[PDB]
Amino acid sequence: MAELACFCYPHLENDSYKFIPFNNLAIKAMLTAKVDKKDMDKFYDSIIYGIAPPPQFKKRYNTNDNSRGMNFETIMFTKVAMLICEALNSLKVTQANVSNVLSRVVSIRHLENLVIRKENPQDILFHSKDLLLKSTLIAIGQSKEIETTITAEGGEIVFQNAAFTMWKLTYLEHQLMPILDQNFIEYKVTLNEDKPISDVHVKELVAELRWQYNKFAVITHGKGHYRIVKYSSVANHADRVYATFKSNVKTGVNNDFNLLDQRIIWQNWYAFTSSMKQGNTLDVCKRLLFQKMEPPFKGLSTDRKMDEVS
Amino acid sequence: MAELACFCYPHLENDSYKFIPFNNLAIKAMLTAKVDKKDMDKFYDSIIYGIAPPPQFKKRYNTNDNSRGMNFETIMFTKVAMLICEALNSLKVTQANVSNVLSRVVSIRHLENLVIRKENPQDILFHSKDLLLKSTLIAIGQSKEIETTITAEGGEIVFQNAAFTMWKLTYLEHQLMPILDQNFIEYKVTLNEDKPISDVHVKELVAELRWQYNKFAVITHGKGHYRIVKYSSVANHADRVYATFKSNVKTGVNNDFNLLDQRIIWQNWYAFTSSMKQGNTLDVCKRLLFQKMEPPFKGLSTDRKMDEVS
Amino acid sequence: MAELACFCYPHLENDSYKFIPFNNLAIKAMLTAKVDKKDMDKFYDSIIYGIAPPPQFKKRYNTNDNSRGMNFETIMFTKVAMLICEALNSLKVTQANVSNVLSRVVSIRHLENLVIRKENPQDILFHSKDLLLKSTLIAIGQSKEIETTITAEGGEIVFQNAAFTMWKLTYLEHQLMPILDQNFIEYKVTLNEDKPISDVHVKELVAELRWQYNKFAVITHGKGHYRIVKYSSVANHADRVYATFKSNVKTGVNNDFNLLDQRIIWQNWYAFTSSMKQGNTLDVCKRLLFQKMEPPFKGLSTDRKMDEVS
Amino acid sequence: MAELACFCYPHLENDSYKFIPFNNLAIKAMLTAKVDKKDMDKFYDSIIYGIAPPPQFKKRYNTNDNSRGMNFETIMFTKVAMLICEALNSLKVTQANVSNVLSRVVSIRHLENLVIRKENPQDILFHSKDLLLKSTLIAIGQSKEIETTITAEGGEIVFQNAAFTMWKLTYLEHQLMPILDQNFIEYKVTLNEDKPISDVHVKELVAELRWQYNKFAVITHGKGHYRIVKYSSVANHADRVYATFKSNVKTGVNNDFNLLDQRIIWQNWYAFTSSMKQGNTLDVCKRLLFQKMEPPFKGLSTDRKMDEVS
Amino acid sequence: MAELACFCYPHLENDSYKFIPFNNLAIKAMLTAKVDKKDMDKFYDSIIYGIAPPPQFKKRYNTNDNSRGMNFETIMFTKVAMLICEALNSLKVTQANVSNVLSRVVSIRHLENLVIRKENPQDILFHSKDLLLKSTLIAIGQSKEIETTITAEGGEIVFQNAAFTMWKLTYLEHQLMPILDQNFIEYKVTLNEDKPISDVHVKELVAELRWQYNKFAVITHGKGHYRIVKYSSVANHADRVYATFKSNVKTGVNNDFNLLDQRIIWQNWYAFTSSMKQGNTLDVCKRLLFQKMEPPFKGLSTDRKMDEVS
Amino acid sequence: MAELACFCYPHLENDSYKFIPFNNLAIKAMLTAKVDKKDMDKFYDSIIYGIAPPPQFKKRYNTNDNSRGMNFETIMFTKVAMLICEALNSLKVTQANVSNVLSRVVSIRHLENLVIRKENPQDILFHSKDLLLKSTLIAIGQSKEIETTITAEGGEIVFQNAAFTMWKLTYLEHQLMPILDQNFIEYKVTLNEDKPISDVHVKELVAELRWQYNKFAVITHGKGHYRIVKYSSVANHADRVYATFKSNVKTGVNNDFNLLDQRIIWQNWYAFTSSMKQGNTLDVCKRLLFQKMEPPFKGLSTDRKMDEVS
Predict the structure, then answer these.
(1) One MF term in GO for this entry (chains A, B, C, D, E, F)?
(2) Is D107 annotated as ligand-binding?
């Protein structure tokens, strides 16, 4: 969604790098500037409003002629920028790394959701700076830890178990970078703890997903939680995860992929992703997606049905 | 929902009975009137606003202390009343029958929907008085004919086949007697013609109902069309149909019941209703409703799924 | 409330007097005019907008400095004027009488209510010009007939009997000359027919008046119907009726007074008015109003009570 | 209206139990949760929003499919919860009792009214924490003291005496759990002090109740104040008080009942309740309610009448 | 923008084909229908709302999941449909041709503009059915005649000459199929007559275009008028015209192209299009577009400048 | 736009003059006052609201009969007054000078823009009192320094270079003294630093001005920055600058004039102003304005064009 350099810039004071949010009028000035090709990757001095992002990220910002960026003039842009700065400032980043850290692309919608979590007095993140930092570092790609319920990006809870918390992603209502397609619906299921889950608690989740979300495929991107996406979108999900798997192999970055419970994941998605982890090609993997198959917890849908009839 | 006498009264002119709509201020005057117990079943003379319904039907009309009636002061009350009068006036009803005809209870919501159909220049009923009369006579219980797509009460079309037309019932938005429970959702599937339906056209309907309405039971009330109701409501439907079957037996009125296609109807509903037609008791019939069973078109849900994934 | 000359003027065409409504801009011009004392009682020629009422009636019209008149610029002024003209035009008034007819003071609020009745397709007056004329002639003081339910000024029906129709007077919502005191509440009870009324139908009315209007006195002005007025106002009613009785004696005009049913009228009002008809003085009559007395249908209030408890 | 456990949960810190209000998002999470039958009576851990009420109280909370509960997402829910917690926290409740204390059902509308009293700088409760605690403990069922004017739940004062304060209950306008029937009207009359009341001060109250509330029955529930309820509702009041009297006998809880002044209470209610205290059956008691009788302060209604006529 | 079959269907009555507009509820029903692959190109019978377009044109209609179609539920859809039907009905189309006529793709925005012209009493098209037919037949591709000012699609006149009329295209404000990109600006310059144009009248147009539209390229699509498009869009225009030139060659349809005045057209566009007419390839033509060149009416921009300074 | 005495008055406390803002009700009182001709130039004592400006400046203030002044009752009047007072209070003005300082006419719109700059946390002036003072002293005519980008009056940045910052003047939206002509558009180009500017950075600015502002003349008033004004206004600009040049010569005040870069300034303006500096008459100077001439960076407009076509 955007590189971290779209929100802040590094400032060396006291043999350590502190990160500072952009003023939105500085971004606005940048968008109107004539800049040499040699300077497109350098931070821009607006003179009146402080420093601004490198003009090379111009398309990340919505303008009269760009709707595929972010709304950098909203309050949420500043809140997201401050959330990034706080997390990155706790890391005492060193001179060799600042470039890699800022050039990293992160999910803006994940960050706006964490803002929404932390500003809510009811939410644990409002009351624990440690959990907020952990949660943010995960979304910034500066942590090895896995996103769980405690550290979830958030949303509206629509189902909860001893083992699982199902959330509805509210991206349509975001201020910074909302999803523009009004047909969008996506959920995620995060794990509450990391100790083994009983068959009965798996059953309960599977049963809810077949009754209340029968038109949704249960998939994962390998990062330790389930993604509940409409079947009309799994093919696009497959492309993205494969491209991400392929790239992370070429670049040597961490590339472990948690296929998660085969009793829960859509069987075609399990096939597709298991073929990925085996090193197969895109065309070979994607074929298992569209290949019909039928070999699960039998009779779970008819249980919820009769419960309702009573 | 209400007896026909709640909308019109009979007037003998020219050796034939013409039916006349009530003024709503006549109803209002009636609701404030002191009436002898002997006159509760007689039409009421408001003096200023003409005749009014028998005070015995007071509860059919919404007031400060009644919300289970109709909104007789709306324009829709008059349109519905005129629709009834037109249909009943084409029948040259005779002196012995007027009582039975008016005392008959009909669905107001069905009549408001027929009004909505006929006032729409796009709808065939707007352009054929014969079809409108047929359609209304069915809803008034003064016709032996079966409601089909052509003569359907109406609603929003949400699926259509060579053989079927699926409608969404808009009762939440009615003016005269809307459903007050905002959780209400109900569809009906009417037959387009009365010649046999191919297996493939049945398949197409069943497939849509499992994909798009998996949380809905396919039942019928025996009147020749399907009713798509949430499982949380089939038990109440069962009570009503049985009470109607029981009564129509005691009173000798027509009591044929079309169970419709067993490949479409929910198997528990087919069992429940087949036990009814065999003369069983309520407790025996209703038991087959809650009795779990599992012995259909196999693999039809997985067909639509893969179609979407493409 | 206003003389008839405030609404129309006489025009002699074809040896008969036709009456013509004023344009409101003609009235407005009149209100700004300098007029000789000798011409204050003559109709005024606005030149641009036709004839206008005699400047002597200036205070009948609301202005920046008068709120005790009528709102002669509303549509209702024209409707009321036309209603008067129609009634007076059916009388072929003669040259000697026009002065007396126009100088007569009538109730504007009664006339606005008759307009409201006749413009309503539900009301009998909408469909019978004869009843409308009769009803208007009563309110214009050009008829010997008594106002009954059929010819009532109107309002909201709040109770109805075989013998009685109780109306709520809506004067607070009038456009032409509303009551300005927002605490105003007044009802009237008109007789449906003029044949004798049974004890049971009297009982029913008395019972309603004690239960639902316990804070209201049942009085009459002698014109053949009951007036339901709050006790805080009967003394003012007494003054007005006496002044009207006194005047009608001095002027020889008709002065019969129908005391109506002593089982219904408030006993103090019956005493007050019976003393009037006997020729007593104001001070003697009014004393019987404030004189406490207690000598009715016993136990009628406790009947309605227990009915409600059930 | 709801058990205290619907608002707070107990926390053992420092050998004493402190009570903590629920976050409304914790309640919301609970309402979506799959819970074992064995855990339905245990407080629920929403993980993200803290603890929540036992899922067994699900129906106390309004949802898309429940309107007979409370609006737990309003600000008033939190204010009411804090009011309960403050009162219960002053009691140093012990481990054996917490269950009984929380399981106790209290009037939410009484608690919302006490909130409205205490937040008003004009009200004595705003300025005396001791009176507020006393007043709340009465409404929580954790006090032996009787509700008087000082500690009344509140409302709009509509009549006041040396001995009495009459209040109108504003339940239609409540935010947390309003009465939904718009025809609802109920008053209460609380005693200002507990020393004897003169006949003249009783007379004054009775006189107001007959003039201004003639359609209302003067009853009590035995808790030391009068309840002014429409006659159309006394039968339902009778059922509730008897069921409460019956239960409190079976459970041994305090069951004294103050019949209050027989010159004020509706004579049928006095009969009904006196039969209750004598141990009679429901059918025997309730019969005295509908039994007509007529054997009071004579001529008090005619005093207020003549006062108004002046 | 859409085939003519998206608006009407043919009906053989009286050995001639009359064309009939679709009801929008018929289209809506079609969009929900299950249709055999063999019938996708056949007109669809909605049963309740008449005939509908072939389901193969589903994407021409805006839905919850399609924004690249038209708003067929607006009034403008019906007006456009009637305009097409009127024009096509004057042609007595024969059985062999109906398919070709309906399958023809036309500009909806051109048709909505002609509607706007004809409904305006000020516009000549409102008063001449012959001119309207001519104008529509041009936009329907059923006429050999060239669009001139008289028969222009319309818009806001922003400049006019003895020889030229410049219009602003209002596509952003259209109801049926507006341009969605809010940055859109496009003008057209139509010829008033077809007799030769003096150098001075060309000068006047060129002068206005350089002063008031310096950021716009003067191009044509070969149909006899100028198109004033921003330079940021000429490359896309080039693609479309070439694809249209290429296709019309392969299909043998009329393919004459009027390059128009080389003193007016942007020199790069003249080069690009002259290379097209010579049969060159796309890559060869398009190269002349981006090839810088500079060899016009000298000093025309400085004339308007000094005029303004005065 | 107004003398400084329209905003504040001098107060001698502690052998130094402090300047105090006017209350707007003091101004209002002054505007209603009868004042001797001898006192028209003295500050006015409103008695109730403090001191007010000399009645001789009455026309500087908008009233029912004056629209060519300022809106002295807005909040902006007070902010501007305080900004002046702060700047003037840092100068320890002496007794001989106060008259000259206050009588000085300054641009109100410049001062309102500096307020808008300083109240914005994003703007450097918000964070540096020294820069704000410098910037204000320039606008007050109490500084020898030249307005640069850092100290610019402000506006919306529409173009920025290593060497230049182009601003749009928002005078239409001002609160204190907006431009009333809605056709007004004016920009200014300020220099970022005062070290020499490369040819390439000049080229970049000239290129933007020809593409995006072709209808605007590049002129200066000699104060060290460029003014981008429509050609329809340069003649009026010429009058004003000449009158200012003429006056400053007669009064001996500073009269240096920076013609700025002849490669940027409109050649006619350079001629006009160079003739001014040579001492020529108005008629001689102004003639060079309207005199056509054509002898610049060739082919710069065609560079931006082709860039857009790509």
Answers:
(1) ATP binding
(2) yes
